[PDB]
Amino acid sequence: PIELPPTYITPYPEISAGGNGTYRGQDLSSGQSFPRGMQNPVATVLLLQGDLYCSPNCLATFQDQARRDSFGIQSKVALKTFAAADQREAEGRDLRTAYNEIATDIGRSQQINENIIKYPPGNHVLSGGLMTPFHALAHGMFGLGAPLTFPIQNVGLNVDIRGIPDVMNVIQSARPVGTSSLDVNFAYDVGKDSNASWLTLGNITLRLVGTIDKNASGAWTFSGEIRAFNAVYDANPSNHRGWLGENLTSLLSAVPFTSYSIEIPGSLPVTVSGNL
């Protein structure tokens, strides 16, 4: 979720409200390629495939597409579409709508090539929803190295302090009846809480900040926040062979990539307690 600041500045400026210029590229020679009233077929397909792509059949479906054209124009455009879509979700928009809006606009394009949809490397943000992992994947190939945000609130963390022994190690160490600073960082396998996000972040470093408070004997209440150190997306497709599978991984390793910095801002407030 996460609202996003009033002046965020989308990477896909609206141009003219509705979708019209928003996504999709420049022209060439010469407004031909196919009859002029006809919807761009690549868009037609995308539209035909929305029920699968905007669902938990997304990966299987995409996998099949990639195989069918060897990561060709259709495959690429769909991928760039997923990104735009996931972006819009992160700007608080129903994904499936956003998608159709995007597919519609590609539909107006008179060309048939891999760039009939723009990928502005700009200021991307990951929703943490369904197409997030593809958004990251997309970014590795098209993003030209330019780092992107993945707000901590969108990762799907759910951190129980009480079951990281290293933290609990620190909490339980000589103390007074009032304050005492806690600022420990620690490894954390986003997979404990989310696999979708783990596909994009693996292990990250989290940081816990606050104080604890002792009473009668006894128990104690740590309240404070968790925060995350920026991660590094490894664009090398051999690093996604788990998730993408042989065929796509192979295809994707002809295509060039640049790794990028994933910034992970925000606080995740946390309160907790334990005892002797």
mmCIF file of C-alpha atoms in Angstrom:
data_model
loop_
_atom_site.group_PDB
_atom_site.id
_atom_site.type_symbol
_atom_site.label_atom_id
_atom_site.label_comp_id
_atom_site.label_asym_id
_atom_site.label_seq_id
_atom_site.Cartn_x
_atom_site.Cartn_y
_atom_site.Cartn_z
ATOM 1 C CA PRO A 1 0.000 0.000 0.000
ATOM 2 C CA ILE A 2 1.639 3.286 1.266
ATOM 3 C CA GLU A 3 -0.025 6.522 0.047
ATOM 4 C CA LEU A 4 3.094 8.081 -1.696
ATOM 5 C CA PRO A 5 4.094 11.777 -1.271
ATOM 6 C CA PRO A 6 1.954 14.533 -2.723
ATOM 7 C CA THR A 7 4.686 15.411 -5.213
ATOM 8 C CA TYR A 8 5.984 11.985 -6.155
ATOM 9 C CA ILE A 9 6.413 12.554 -9.915
ATOM 10 C CA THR A 10 5.328 9.477 -11.854
ATOM 11 C CA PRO A 11 7.738 8.007 -14.405
ATOM 12 C CA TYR A 12 4.783 7.815 -16.837
ATOM 13 C CA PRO A 13 3.473 11.375 -16.920
ATOM 14 C CA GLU A 14 -0.224 11.406 -17.805
ATOM 15 C CA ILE A 15 0.174 13.505 -21.028
ATOM 16 C CA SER A 16 -3.640 13.661 -21.665
ATOM 17 C CA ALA A 17 -5.878 11.903 -19.022
ATOM 18 C CA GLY A 18 -7.337 8.456 -19.984
ATOM 19 C CA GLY A 19 -4.122 6.730 -21.246
ATOM 20 C CA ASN A 20 -3.635 8.359 -24.685
ATOM 21 C CA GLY A 21 0.047 9.388 -24.965
ATOM 22 C CA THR A 22 1.011 8.035 -21.580
ATOM 23 C CA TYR A 23 2.640 4.703 -22.556
ATOM 24 C CA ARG A 24 4.040 4.024 -26.086
ATOM 25 C CA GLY A 25 6.660 5.527 -28.289
ATOM 26 C CA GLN A 26 7.662 7.624 -31.286
ATOM 27 C CA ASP A 27 6.904 7.087 -35.007
ATOM 28 C CA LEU A 28 9.000 6.067 -38.046
ATOM 29 C CA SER A 29 8.118 5.718 -41.720
ATOM 30 C CA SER A 30 5.241 6.290 -41.977
ATOM 31 C CA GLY A 31 1.877 5.525 -40.256
ATOM 32 C CA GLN A 32 1.776 2.177 -42.136
ATOM 33 C CA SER A 33 2.541 -1.443 -41.129
ATOM 34 C CA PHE A 34 -1.138 -2.454 -41.157
ATOM 35 C CA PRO A 35 -4.451 -0.794 -42.025
ATOM 36 C CA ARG A 36 -4.957 2.456 -40.227
ATOM 37 C CA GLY A 37 -8.179 1.885 -38.255
ATOM 38 C CA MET A 38 -7.067 -1.531 -36.998
ATOM 39 C CA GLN A 39 -5.885 -1.967 -33.442
ATOM 40 C CA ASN A 40 -2.235 -2.846 -33.136
ATOM 41 C CA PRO A 41 -2.285 -6.664 -32.924
ATOM 42 C CA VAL A 42 0.331 -6.858 -30.227
ATOM 43 C CA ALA A 43 -2.107 -4.901 -28.113
ATOM 44 C CA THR A 44 -4.923 -7.215 -29.191
ATOM 45 C CA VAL A 45 -3.011 -10.167 -27.757
ATOM 46 C CA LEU A 46 -2.182 -8.460 -24.454
ATOM 47 C CA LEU A 47 -5.856 -7.662 -24.119
ATOM 48 C CA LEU A 48 -6.789 -11.254 -24.873
ATOM 49 C CA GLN A 49 -4.290 -12.316 -22.195
ATOM 50 C CA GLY A 50 -5.253 -10.007 -19.311
ATOM 51 C CA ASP A 51 -7.344 -12.604 -17.487
ATOM 52 C CA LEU A 52 -4.297 -14.812 -17.274
ATOM 53 C CA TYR A 53 -1.583 -12.227 -16.868
ATOM 54 C CA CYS A 54 -3.407 -10.270 -14.129
ATOM 55 C CA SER A 55 -3.906 -13.410 -12.125
ATOM 56 C CA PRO A 56 -1.834 -15.990 -10.371
ATOM 57 C CA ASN A 57 -1.471 -17.682 -13.796
ATOM 58 C CA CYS A 58 0.780 -14.838 -14.777
ATOM 59 C CA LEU A 59 4.183 -16.643 -14.718
ATOM 60 C CA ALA A 60 3.158 -19.853 -16.395
ATOM 61 C CA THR A 61 1.476 -17.755 -19.086
ATOM 62 C CA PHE A 62 4.389 -15.513 -19.621
ATOM 63 C CA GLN A 63 6.745 -18.454 -19.663
ATOM 64 C CA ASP A 64 4.740 -19.881 -22.468
ATOM 65 C CA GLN A 65 4.794 -16.618 -24.385
ATOM 66 C CA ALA A 66 8.553 -16.325 -24.049
ATOM 67 C CA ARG A 67 9.002 -19.786 -25.366
ATOM 68 C CA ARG A 68 6.621 -19.227 -28.207
ATOM 69 C CA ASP A 69 8.600 -16.227 -29.597
ATOM 70 C CA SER A 70 12.047 -16.542 -27.938
ATOM 71 C CA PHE A 71 11.757 -13.409 -25.906
ATOM 72 C CA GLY A 72 10.653 -11.520 -28.967
ATOM 73 C CA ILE A 73 8.626 -8.403 -29.552
ATOM 74 C CA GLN A 74 5.449 -9.773 -27.954
ATOM 75 C CA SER A 75 7.309 -11.109 -24.961
ATOM 76 C CA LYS A 76 9.205 -7.841 -24.418
ATOM 77 C CA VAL A 77 6.172 -5.602 -24.807
ATOM 78 C CA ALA A 78 4.176 -7.708 -22.318
ATOM 79 C CA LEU A 79 7.071 -7.463 -19.902
ATOM 80 C CA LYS A 80 7.360 -3.659 -20.232
ATOM 81 C CA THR A 81 3.571 -3.630 -19.796
ATOM 82 C CA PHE A 82 3.735 -5.543 -16.546
ATOM 83 C CA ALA A 83 6.138 -2.917 -15.269
ATOM 84 C CA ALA A 84 3.926 0.078 -16.102
ATOM 85 C CA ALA A 85 1.023 -1.871 -14.621
ATOM 86 C CA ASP A 86 2.828 -2.694 -11.372
ATOM 87 C CA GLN A 87 4.049 0.883 -11.239
ATOM 88 C CA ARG A 88 0.461 2.139 -11.428
ATOM 89 C CA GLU A 89 -0.626 -0.266 -8.673
ATOM 90 C CA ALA A 90 2.126 1.346 -6.539
ATOM 91 C CA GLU A 91 0.619 4.733 -7.347
ATOM 92 C CA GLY A 92 -2.638 3.265 -5.923
ATOM 93 C CA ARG A 93 -4.609 2.072 -8.981
ATOM 94 C CA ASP A 94 -6.487 -1.199 -9.597
ATOM 95 C CA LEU A 95 -3.963 -3.317 -11.460
ATOM 96 C CA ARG A 96 -6.235 -4.928 -14.038
ATOM 97 C CA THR A 97 -7.652 -1.556 -15.077
ATOM 98 C CA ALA A 98 -4.211 0.007 -15.370
ATOM 99 C CA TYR A 99 -3.213 -2.935 -17.490
ATOM 100 C CA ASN A 100 -6.109 -2.569 -19.900
ATOM 101 C CA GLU A 101 -5.509 1.153 -20.119
ATOM 102 C CA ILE A 102 -1.877 0.393 -21.043
ATOM 103 C CA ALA A 103 -2.712 -2.361 -23.526
ATOM 104 C CA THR A 104 -5.322 -0.042 -25.096
ATOM 105 C CA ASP A 105 -2.743 2.654 -25.664
ATOM 106 C CA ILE A 106 -0.250 0.323 -27.287
ATOM 107 C CA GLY A 107 -3.242 -0.539 -29.452
ATOM 108 C CA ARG A 108 -3.110 2.936 -30.934
ATOM 109 C CA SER A 109 0.521 2.468 -32.028
ATOM 110 C CA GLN A 110 1.099 2.125 -35.769
ATOM 111 C CA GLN A 111 4.495 0.358 -35.407
ATOM 112 C CA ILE A 112 5.306 -3.313 -34.538
ATOM 113 C CA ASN A 113 8.563 -3.443 -32.648
ATOM 114 C CA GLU A 114 9.951 -3.867 -29.143
ATOM 115 C CA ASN A 115 9.534 -0.179 -28.186
ATOM 116 C CA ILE A 116 5.921 0.478 -29.056
ATOM 117 C CA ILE A 117 5.690 0.906 -25.243
ATOM 118 C CA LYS A 118 8.111 3.295 -23.439
ATOM 119 C CA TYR A 119 10.263 2.208 -20.547
ATOM 120 C CA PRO A 120 11.265 5.416 -18.913
ATOM 121 C CA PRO A 121 14.092 4.393 -16.602
ATOM 122 C CA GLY A 122 13.032 7.345 -14.393
ATOM 123 C CA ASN A 123 11.727 7.019 -10.888
ATOM 124 C CA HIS A 124 10.249 3.563 -10.609
ATOM 125 C CA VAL A 125 8.382 2.230 -7.593
ATOM 126 C CA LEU A 126 7.536 -1.434 -6.845
ATOM 127 C CA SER A 127 3.981 -2.103 -5.653
ATOM 128 C CA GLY A 128 4.722 -5.269 -3.752
ATOM 129 C CA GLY A 129 1.764 -6.867 -5.444
ATOM 130 C CA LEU A 130 1.411 -9.500 -8.127
ATOM 131 C CA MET A 131 3.525 -8.118 -10.955
ATOM 132 C CA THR A 132 6.216 -6.682 -8.744
ATOM 133 C CA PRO A 133 8.764 -9.451 -9.564
ATOM 134 C CA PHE A 134 8.322 -8.873 -13.267
ATOM 135 C CA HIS A 135 8.578 -5.148 -12.692
ATOM 136 C CA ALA A 136 11.996 -5.831 -11.095
ATOM 137 C CA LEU A 137 12.970 -8.235 -13.894
ATOM 138 C CA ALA A 138 11.870 -5.620 -16.430
ATOM 139 C CA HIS A 139 13.910 -3.034 -14.741
ATOM 140 C CA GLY A 140 17.033 -5.173 -14.911
ATOM 141 C CA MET A 141 16.832 -5.356 -18.677
ATOM 142 C CA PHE A 142 15.397 -2.012 -19.718
ATOM 143 C CA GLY A 143 16.128 0.255 -16.769
ATOM 144 C CA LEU A 144 19.656 1.152 -17.881
ATOM 145 C CA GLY A 145 21.043 0.622 -14.323
ATOM 146 C CA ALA A 146 18.948 3.378 -12.785
ATOM 147 C CA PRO A 147 18.039 2.534 -9.218
ATOM 148 C CA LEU A 148 14.413 2.245 -8.017
ATOM 149 C CA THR A 149 12.405 2.422 -4.792
ATOM 150 C CA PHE A 150 10.578 -0.468 -3.052
ATOM 151 C CA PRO A 151 8.922 1.070 0.031
ATOM 152 C CA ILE A 152 9.382 -1.012 3.176
ATOM 153 C CA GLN A 153 5.634 -1.007 3.700
ATOM 154 C CA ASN A 154 5.168 -2.842 0.352
ATOM 155 C CA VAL A 155 7.543 -5.755 0.961
ATOM 156 C CA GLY A 156 5.087 -7.776 3.082
ATOM 157 C CA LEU A 157 7.330 -8.096 6.102
ATOM 158 C CA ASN A 158 5.893 -9.292 9.366
ATOM 159 C CA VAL A 159 8.774 -9.345 11.710
ATOM 160 C CA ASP A 160 8.507 -11.120 15.034
ATOM 161 C CA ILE A 161 11.454 -9.735 16.987
ATOM 162 C CA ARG A 162 10.957 -12.531 19.538
ATOM 163 C CA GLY A 163 12.219 -15.190 17.154
ATOM 164 C CA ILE A 164 15.499 -13.676 16.121
ATOM 165 C CA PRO A 165 17.797 -14.953 18.798
ATOM 166 C CA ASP A 166 20.507 -12.329 18.134
ATOM 167 C CA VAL A 167 18.069 -9.469 18.842
ATOM 168 C CA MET A 168 16.625 -11.249 21.884
ATOM 169 C CA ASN A 169 20.240 -11.907 22.891
ATOM 170 C CA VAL A 170 20.728 -8.129 23.034
ATOM 171 C CA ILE A 171 17.451 -7.237 24.741
ATOM 172 C CA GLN A 172 18.323 -9.604 27.568
ATOM 173 C CA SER A 173 21.575 -7.989 28.779
ATOM 174 C CA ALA A 174 22.269 -5.917 31.934
ATOM 175 C CA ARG A 175 19.796 -3.008 32.221
ATOM 176 C CA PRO A 176 18.036 -0.422 34.432
ATOM 177 C CA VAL A 177 14.366 0.163 35.400
ATOM 178 C CA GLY A 178 13.916 2.840 32.625
ATOM 179 C CA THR A 179 15.653 3.533 29.259
ATOM 180 C CA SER A 180 18.333 1.688 27.349
ATOM 181 C CA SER A 181 19.240 2.032 23.670
ATOM 182 C CA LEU A 182 18.742 -0.711 21.202
ATOM 183 C CA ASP A 183 20.166 -0.324 17.744
ATOM 184 C CA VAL A 184 20.997 -3.655 16.225
ATOM 185 C CA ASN A 185 20.961 -4.604 12.561
ATOM 186 C CA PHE A 186 20.411 -8.186 11.350
ATOM 187 C CA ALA A 187 20.154 -10.457 8.321
ATOM 188 C CA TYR A 188 16.640 -11.299 7.283
ATOM 189 C CA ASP A 189 15.385 -13.648 4.633
ATOM 190 C CA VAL A 190 12.376 -11.836 3.181
ATOM 191 C CA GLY A 191 11.153 -15.355 2.516
ATOM 192 C CA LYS A 192 10.240 -15.919 6.191
ATOM 193 C CA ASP A 193 7.282 -13.655 5.309
ATOM 194 C CA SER A 194 6.946 -13.326 1.535
ATOM 195 C CA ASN A 195 8.179 -15.356 -1.484
ATOM 196 C CA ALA A 196 7.061 -12.858 -4.147
ATOM 197 C CA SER A 197 9.200 -10.273 -2.449
ATOM 198 C CA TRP A 198 11.979 -12.753 -1.851
ATOM 199 C CA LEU A 199 12.285 -13.198 -5.568
ATOM 200 C CA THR A 200 13.277 -9.558 -5.767
ATOM 201 C CA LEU A 201 15.213 -9.037 -2.495
ATOM 202 C CA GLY A 202 16.559 -12.353 -1.115
ATOM 203 C CA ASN A 203 18.203 -11.504 2.204
ATOM 204 C CA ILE A 204 18.145 -7.894 3.218
ATOM 205 C CA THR A 205 19.516 -6.187 6.274
ATOM 206 C CA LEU A 206 17.049 -4.870 8.741
ATOM 207 C CA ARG A 207 17.699 -2.538 11.542
ATOM 208 C CA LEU A 208 15.872 -2.270 14.839
ATOM 209 C CA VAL A 209 15.835 1.005 16.839
ATOM 210 C CA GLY A 210 14.255 1.797 20.159
ATOM 211 C CA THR A 211 14.367 1.227 23.879
ATOM 212 C CA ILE A 212 13.105 -1.365 26.369
ATOM 213 C CA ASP A 213 11.563 -0.915 29.840
ATOM 214 C CA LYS A 214 11.760 -3.163 32.952
ATOM 215 C CA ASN A 215 9.234 -3.493 35.775
ATOM 216 C CA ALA A 216 8.817 -5.339 39.131
ATOM 217 C CA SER A 217 11.229 -8.129 38.033
ATOM 218 C CA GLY A 218 10.543 -8.809 35.229
ATOM 219 C CA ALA A 219 9.063 -8.272 31.784
ATOM 220 C CA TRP A 220 9.875 -5.466 29.402
ATOM 221 C CA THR A 221 8.340 -3.581 26.530
ATOM 222 C CA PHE A 222 10.478 -2.716 23.524
ATOM 223 C CA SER A 223 8.803 -0.208 21.301
ATOM 224 C CA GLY A 224 10.624 1.229 18.310
ATOM 225 C CA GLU A 225 10.802 0.841 14.543
ATOM 226 C CA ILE A 226 12.300 -1.441 11.942
ATOM 227 C CA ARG A 227 14.046 -0.050 8.876
ATOM 228 C CA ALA A 228 15.840 -1.512 5.945
ATOM 229 C CA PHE A 229 19.178 -1.069 4.296
ATOM 230 C CA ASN A 230 19.153 -0.639 0.542
ATOM 231 C CA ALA A 231 19.560 -3.894 -1.384
ATOM 232 C CA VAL A 232 21.128 -4.845 -4.707
ATOM 233 C CA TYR A 233 19.188 -6.470 -7.524
ATOM 234 C CA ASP A 234 21.428 -8.880 -9.392
ATOM 235 C CA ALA A 235 20.194 -8.641 -12.963
ATOM 236 C CA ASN A 236 22.073 -11.792 -14.034
ATOM 237 C CA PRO A 237 19.494 -14.225 -15.227
ATOM 238 C CA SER A 238 21.403 -17.202 -13.831
ATOM 239 C CA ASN A 239 20.292 -15.762 -10.512
ATOM 240 C CA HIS A 240 16.636 -16.326 -11.300
ATOM 241 C CA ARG A 241 16.853 -19.764 -12.743
ATOM 242 C CA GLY A 242 14.888 -20.984 -9.787
ATOM 243 C CA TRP A 243 11.910 -18.862 -10.547
ATOM 244 C CA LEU A 244 11.924 -18.322 -14.312
ATOM 245 C CA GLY A 245 12.874 -21.862 -15.325
ATOM 246 C CA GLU A 246 15.314 -23.225 -17.865
ATOM 247 C CA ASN A 247 13.779 -21.904 -21.015
ATOM 248 C CA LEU A 248 13.272 -18.291 -20.001
ATOM 249 C CA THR A 249 16.546 -18.166 -18.117
ATOM 250 C CA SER A 250 18.313 -19.281 -21.243
ATOM 251 C CA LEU A 251 16.547 -16.831 -23.517
ATOM 252 C CA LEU A 252 17.160 -13.989 -21.002
ATOM 253 C CA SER A 253 20.873 -14.593 -20.918
ATOM 254 C CA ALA A 254 21.361 -13.546 -24.529
ATOM 255 C CA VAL A 255 19.777 -10.217 -23.536
ATOM 256 C CA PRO A 256 21.890 -7.583 -21.782
ATOM 257 C CA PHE A 257 21.238 -6.378 -18.253
ATOM 258 C CA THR A 258 22.492 -3.928 -15.639
ATOM 259 C CA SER A 259 22.152 -4.540 -11.922
ATOM 260 C CA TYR A 260 20.589 -1.785 -9.837
ATOM 261 C CA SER A 261 20.119 -0.372 -6.352
ATOM 262 C CA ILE A 262 16.777 -1.086 -4.620
ATOM 263 C CA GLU A 263 16.113 1.693 -2.088
ATOM 264 C CA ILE A 264 13.792 0.556 0.747
ATOM 265 C CA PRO A 265 12.609 3.596 2.735
ATOM 266 C CA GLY A 266 10.229 3.800 5.668
ATOM 267 C CA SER A 267 9.460 2.831 9.224
ATOM 268 C CA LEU A 268 7.632 -0.291 10.361
ATOM 269 C CA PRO A 269 6.527 0.426 13.946
ATOM 270 C CA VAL A 270 7.027 -2.432 16.386
ATOM 271 C CA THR A 271 6.105 -3.139 20.009
ATOM 272 C CA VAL A 272 6.760 -6.356 21.894
ATOM 273 C CA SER A 273 7.314 -8.007 25.277
ATOM 274 C CA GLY A 274 8.958 -10.947 27.082
ATOM 275 C CA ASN A 275 10.138 -12.132 30.522
ATOM 276 C CA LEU A 276 12.661 -13.927 32.813
#
